[PDB]
Subunit: 291 residues, 6 copies
């Protein structure tokens, strides 16, 4: 029962992902391959990062995360394979996932394999890591890798060797911290009483609006449930709602809800209606909150 | 070899379904998770119902159906879990599904777990039920459920415990019939000789048109295969064809076929062309039929 | 550990695929069902063949390929089931898939089951076959098949039996070669010294442009890597670049790459930018290439 | 130098308007035909009234306003022709139009000729009338009018006669006030101290938002220039700004301006940027304003 | 008091029409320039013809029609200038236009000037002509015409000289009939009892549907006002209504009306709703009619 | 017979332009008002400039050009009224407009009145000017101008006083050169043998592609008709055609034509087909030409 959770930019409109899965079953016959999603904006490492950072706590320990967008495919670049440290609690409150008090996950229990292009930036900062390796061994990758399909050659193939029990430390040399590429994560700016950030994503298929203002940012300003907030979107939209746990707390259908989403971030929405879709609100718009 | 069949409004554009699956594999190591679909219109209980009602006869006995759109997520509402009575024949003819004479399914062989918001209305009407329970036991749900993710906390998680052998009767107290929420199903109206109903769904990806006029409505009007019919849509666009078993019976490509779809309902299409898409025909438009 | 790899025109918007899968697990409890894709243009047998021709070398031996668009559903037409001969190398170069030197596949190791409507044309061409059978036995298909769902009745259901070790030769009588329906794939012509083909596909989600001009057409025109090419699309949009192994060979982000794709065909792209989407480039547009 | 100012739902995509104009020049060789607009939503009598109510103070005395949407063309309905009383001041302030102190207009100086379908409702309200006649005389309309072109037959043709000095009282019998069809224009209500109206128009091509909240509603709520206002559109999008004379009062390009428009109504805009288009704001959406 | 009526494909999005007008006012100081329309599909001679054929009876005698789409601009081609014979009655009934009994127009009273590219095909068929000349004299056209602006050089300019009194016979040599280019007009075909033709135009801005089935085609089939008809469009969508003079005869708003439009052609609409726009009905679709 | 040629950003979808025209006929009863166009992108002074720079040679001397986009409406800014110097030849060759050798225009014969916002930048540089005045006199503008309608108050009103014969020098004080606001006109860059500029506009309704590379730029490189050119659009589209006078010179319909447009600028198009529309080519894309 080893598991590979597969997140790519290959789409679901042809056999690309299927080619990867075939090789995964060829290499690790008893594997379960779980699709994260294959629908990310290609080459957008910051977005792919979002789909992979919250994963470990939800999976049984020993799960391998094969995560890939590879614009540098067919170059001398090689992937990185990391064993993370903290599985890490998540959500609005910061807790373990599961029934009861949740399923506590041990440390050093998940492997991420990805292009060394910054895709694992937030995984590394939010979980830490115990070890990190360049993926170079002809035992886990092709000697002649397909120039335009490194998402298969350099992620999917070796992830299945790792899931079969190939020793992580044998995929290639240890990587020093600085050799692991990171993208810049823009910071939430304290601006007087206000916290100033950005709309980080539109929560599809609902049209909810997610910000990069985390619960840790809020509580450092002393903002918890009940706080009457002004959340200004796009510079000109001063929404006004108390912070509430969930959508229905806005009252009637269509009413504005300000809440902490399931990833732990300040968000805004309408109760059982779309906020973002009718007004064509977008990722990257400004987002400011204050009491 | 347990199965959970998972129908949600979570989409496939981020890791939401994957989080649910990870937890299901965590609780039930031997489980196969089968995706039904995740693309339904959020908060549309009637549409979600369409995707789940026809499923039992196709699945092995003991299958759990985890089915969720959750607009009341984070409120005091709790899920219902039901053991259905009859697996129920289906199709245009009413038969068991599978090779040969079909696979006959024993009574009481499927469980649905769902928000108690009306999603199971047509499940209960067409399959009946033997027992129904409120889902409240912290052995099957989180002690501290994520306010905005009840689809995972109150459906995916306890569905995996049920797959894993947790006694159905122990999830919570029994629910009496009037405690199970139901949506209203508009009836097919008789109008002299005409049967008057609705376009219930556009059949994607083909653009066939499905009505809520059932084969039983037709055979009580005396209408059977070979009958010449006038089927009028949106009030303005009429169509004339004999009633035929299939699309190619219309003759040339693009010719109007009027038929019974695989769910047992009167439908209209073009032979290997799209009907709905060029004329922008939509669900909710009226549908009138008469010999 | 039997595998069924499943390609259809059923979509992922309702329960259609799940109904097939449920019957697959019913017949073959052991089975792993792998989705290829379900998003193909309904009834486009050439597009469907594209999503299935390159699969075998990637999969474990014994894999059954359930591949289906069925616009003749409900007619006297019966499916064809074939055991292919060569797994066949693929790629820009022509190699076995996998780590190290790749994994060689024994001959006669895969079964395709599909409508006899030409969908397997390129599979048969590129792989050959050892045996081909009409699928008629009530042991593998329903005695009374659903008229509008032959993709389930005549492909999905019998594919699961074949995965379960049902003898291929026992599905029905042998089919002679002339009874296996084919489509004609237009040839790559020569206008003087230029190669005149077609855009065979837009490569989603990247927007890359794929032509029907194969490696072997290039090498018999004396076109090798490094050759400066003019490629004109749709008879008006000209593009110029060396033939290179990959996208990054183009240099700056956005620059034109002319390359061989992972399927072995002359393709054209922007480096980590979309070519097709901004210019609304389409499958079926002409592609001419000159040195 | 007679003038006919011409407003219709005829469009500018075929020869319809030119056919009317040709007949106008035929009857009144002297005439100047001025287009108001021909792009109104067909059959929307409220929108049409908007394009004609503010015209008189701008035009030379004696001007005939040929104003027409005619969804009842071809019926026994006959047009109404009225001589209005007050030319009426307009604008954000309420002034005469023109250079210096403006040009005063004598009373009873303009004729409107239109279908008796409510199109002149606001014209009659804001201008009053001295006389109103049914248009029936064969001297001014065709003996056998084109059934589908009453905008020409019953408005354009008789308007040219009236421009040519045909006696208004001789077009047909006097109409009593109750025989002149009106629409009801919804009032601006008061929810506590907030003013609750509607978006009356998107102001093309700028994308400005126009409400039905007039200067006089503002001044009887004690709202003057400089007052800080919260204006919410469609029940969810909030905007905040002082009431100012113009767009540039907002400051930076893109900043919210809340202002009185040239027609005298509370409006909202971005300064030299579009407000409506990015947010897909629409006529008919609710508008609430609070101090 | 001369008039030039100006129909072009120049659009109204820049100064192209204004340049033409300036020159027309320059040549003919006393002229009124009446815009017909400028929005026709460029290079569509058949569509351009529709906008000009019905015009003469509406205009004063001596009017010049300057009508131009010019794909052969800058070539050796030269315009044709024609004095038509009969002004021709029109409408659904066939009558003179105007008040009273209509304005009867004398023979030989209108000139059309146009590219000799077939634009005047239906002008000549319906009005006849008395004389036709090639436009070549440098007294009416530029000595050095702008290669890409023949609509101005070879139509607008000489149209103004003709308005200004330049002898028609002096523009260039006479053109014999076979020297005047004609487009082919597909005939209305008889098919048993049905009349089979085409959707000739969508009637913008309303979305009414116009066919090329003339009233004469109807009255030779015995069809008159009150006849119950089945009118089928695009082959698939049929419609049933009596033939009525106008829209409101269909009864309720949105009801199907089948009528004769103001150009004398069989048409189909909804009563004060759009037919074409919701169902995306287009010009070129087939149209079949029968009692 | 005085003429006002009116170019605004007011659109044609309401009565805005009509309000201006009414005041024009009120102030100058014998005026002819010619519409240039009212469809420019609001506040885009560089585009408005394009619609007004080529005008004078086409109009009779003494014509007044009322040209306006006024984002600074309701501020202390006042318009500028200029008498230009050279009427200026135009077109592919640089010639006078009209029949024969064209209509030669005297110097000092046209007045432009516009916002002092840079709209007259190219008018001034291509025609020069003899005098320039601030428009401030209450004899030609309102004492209380409508804050949001300066296109009427500050352009349309005083243009009609000027057309009536109000002395230009009496509208307000003389303006020094530096007080006349100019926008930056980016230069065509000589880059080796290449001329490097930009796509200046899409020529609607055709989809022709206009560049800012003028005939004077070309001939300074020695490029005339016949020159085999490479015109690279958008960095990646190396079109190849000889420079020819007109579209048809490309040969068959759809073929690429490179030519000098009627404004004197290097352009590219297809013969009687659209270049820009199918490929979504846009203003502001790079444009490079070379031999
Ligand atoms: C939000 N869904 C979780 C996935 C989400 N992308 C996340 O990562 O938190 C869970 C459930 O919330 C419900 N939901 C989502 N948005 C709303 C909303 N605005 N109002 C009411 N219910 C909502 C949906 O029915 C869905 O089943
Ligand atoms: C209709 N498909 C079943 C899924 C469908 N949503 C259902 O629930 O019945 C099965 C097969 O019917 C074929 N089909 C669907 N619509 C048409 C049509 N209009 N004409 C011809 N074939 C069709 C498709 O190729 C598909 O493989
Ligand atoms: C191309 N992908 C393979 C699937 C493809 N449909 C095929 O069948 O070859 C593999 C990787 O190539 C990368 N890729 C695709 N297109 C481009 C491009 N135009 N520029 C740079 N990288 C690209 C993607 O990030 C993806 O991870
Ligand atoms: C608003 N225009 C008047 C027509 C308007 N439809 C009305 O009836 O008031 C006049 C001038 O105001 C300017 N204008 C319009 N909207 C804006 C805006 N949002 N910001 C700055 N200027 C604007 C335009 O450039 C135009 O020349
Ligand atoms: C180009 N038209 C002039 C207006 C243009 N906006 C200009 O300012 O030069 C003049 C005539 O050229 C013809 N024309 C324009 N573009 C093409 C083309 N690409 N191919 C053939 N004819 C064309 C049209 O029919 C039109 O009547
Ligand atoms: C149809 N209009 C004539 C122009 C038309 N393009 C023609 O050439 O006949 C005249 C009047 O008929 C009315 N009209 C047009 N279509 C409809 C319709 N479908 N229902 C009711 N009234 C209509 C319009 O309001 C318009 O003012
Ligand atoms: Cl929604
Ligand atoms: Cl958008
Ligand atoms: Cl237990
Ligand atoms: Cl739509
Ligand atoms: Cl059969
Ligand atoms: Cl498109
Ligand atoms: Cl009548
Ligand atoms: Cl919209
Ligand atoms: Cl003369
Ligand atoms: Cl369309
Ligand atoms: Cl076009
Ligand atoms: Cl676009």
């Amino acid at each position: 029962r080893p598991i590979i959770a597969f997140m790519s930019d290959l789409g679901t409109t042809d056999d690309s992902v299927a080619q990867c899965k075939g090789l995964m079953y060829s290499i690790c016959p008893d594997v379960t391959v779980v699709d994260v999603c294959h629908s990310m904006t290609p080459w957008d490492v910051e977005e792919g990062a979002r789909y992979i950072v919250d994963l470990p706590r939800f999976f049984p320990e020993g799960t391998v995360f094969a995560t890939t967008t590879y614009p540098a495919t067919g170059t001398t670049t090689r992937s990185v394979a990391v064993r993370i440290k903290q599985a890490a609690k998540g959500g609005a409150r910061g807790q373990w996932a599961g029934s009861g008090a949740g399923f506590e996950r041990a440390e050093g229990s998940y492997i991420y394999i990805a292009p060394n292009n910054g895709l694992l930036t937030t995984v590394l900062e939010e979980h830490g890591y115990l070890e990190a390796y360049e993926v170079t061994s002809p035992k886990v990758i092709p000697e002649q890798p397909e120039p335009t399909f490194y998402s298969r050659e350099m992620v999917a193939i070796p992830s299945a060797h790792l899931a079969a029990g190939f020793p992580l430390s044998e995929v290639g040399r240890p990587l020093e911290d600085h050799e692991i590429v990171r993208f810049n994560r823009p910071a939430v700016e304290q601006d007087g009483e206000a916290l100033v950030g950005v709309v980080s994503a539109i929560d599809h298929p609902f049209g909810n609006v997610w910000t990069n203002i985390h619960r840790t940012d809020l509580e450092k300003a002393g903002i918890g449930y009940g706080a009457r907030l002004r959340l200004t979107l796009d510079g000109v939209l001063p929404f006004e709602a108390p912070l509430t746990p969930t959508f229905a707390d806005a009252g009637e259908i269509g009413n504005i809800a300000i809440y902490l989403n399931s990833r732990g971030y300040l968000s805004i929405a309408r109760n059982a209606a779309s906020l973002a879709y009718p007004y064509h609100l977008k990722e990257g718009m400004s987002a400011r909150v204050e009491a």
